[PDB]
Design a protein around this ligand. Structure first.
Ligand SMILES: C[C@@H](c1cccc2c(-c3ccc(NS(C)(=O)=O)c(C#N)c3)c(C(=O)O)[nH]c12)N1CC(CN2CC(N)C2)OC1=O
Ligand SMILES: [Zn+2]
Ligand SMILES: [Zn+2]
Length: 232
């Protein structure tokens, strides 16, 4: 009923959208992994009379449900998708997207890691993102590679029209007391990568984490704090 939806509010398989700004939504779904249930976010950005999708809904059936929810709530076609790192909460569902006419994209680093891991593989490679601090335009967003953080390949996404910063899994929500799933993380580089985000997007008004509640710029500093403390 208007609040940002949370893990116990979304059955696995269902997707909800949340309006972030004009022409910007997050998508929220939940998924089981190693016997626990987790929420995760993605982004939807209006791209004229089309939509740009950022990240899958973490699984094939969740991603099919995402497409259906988009049709119900928005009614514009998803034509392109970008996955912001190689984990299943970002690429799981790419095959569903690819069969629904969506052109799927990721950095070459993400594509190589997804392939090596046995995850679904976006079709198209996003060049121009291989060095930390790199940025490229992609429809109505800017893609930014901040450096290694949650993963070595993690990208963040900025929506300049709305000053929305989608941090993906390099950014945690304010209630986070732990650094999430750090299996593929670089805890030493993560604060430096967050500092790069902070420097590059000082006008961000909404910051969306990969999992959990959006907030403001403080999510960035909080993330750096939690990651440093976890490493400690
Ligand atoms: C697919 C993905 C993955 C799965 C499950 C949980 C998470 C998490 C995660 C954790 C705790 C969390 N909150 S809470 C109160 O502590 O429980 C929250 C939240 N809110 C999120 C994140 C994240 O933090 O982004 N991502 C996850 N995976 C898999 C993986 C490495 N696996 C070994 C193989 N190489 C694949 O690495 C990763 O990220
Ligand atoms: Zn991840
Ligand atoms: Zn994640």
């Amino acid at each position: 009923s208007g609040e940002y939806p949370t893990v116990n509010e979304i059955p696995v398989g269902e997707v909800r959208l949340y309006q972030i700004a004009d022409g910007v939504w997050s998508h929220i779904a939940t998924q089981s992994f190693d016997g626990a249930v987790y929420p995760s976010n993605g982004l939807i950005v209006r791209d004229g009379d089309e939509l740009l999708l950022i990240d899958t809904a973490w699984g094939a059936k969740n991603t099919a449900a995402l497409l259906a929810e988009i049709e119900k709530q928005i009614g514009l076609p998803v034509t392109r998708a970008v996955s912001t790192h190689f984990h299943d909460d970002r690429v799981g569902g790419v095959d569903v997207l690819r069969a629904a006419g969506v052109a799927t994209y990721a950095s070459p680093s993400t594509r190589r890691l997804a392939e090596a891991e046995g995850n679904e593989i976006p079709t198209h490679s996003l060049e121009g993102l291989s060095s930390s601090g790199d940025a490229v335009r992609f429809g109505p967003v800017e893609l930014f590679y901040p450096g290694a953080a949650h993963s070595t390949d993690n990208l963040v996404v900025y929506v300049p029209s709305a000053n929305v910063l989608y941090g993906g899994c390099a950014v945690h929500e304010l209630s986070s007391t732990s650094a999430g799933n750090v299996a593929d993380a670089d805890l030493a580089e993560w604060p430096t990568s967050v500092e790069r985000i902070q420097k590059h997007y000082p006008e961000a008004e909404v910051v969306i984490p990969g999992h959990g509640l959006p907030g403001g710029l403080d999510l960035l500093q909080h993330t750096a704090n939690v990651v440093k403390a976890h490493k400690n």
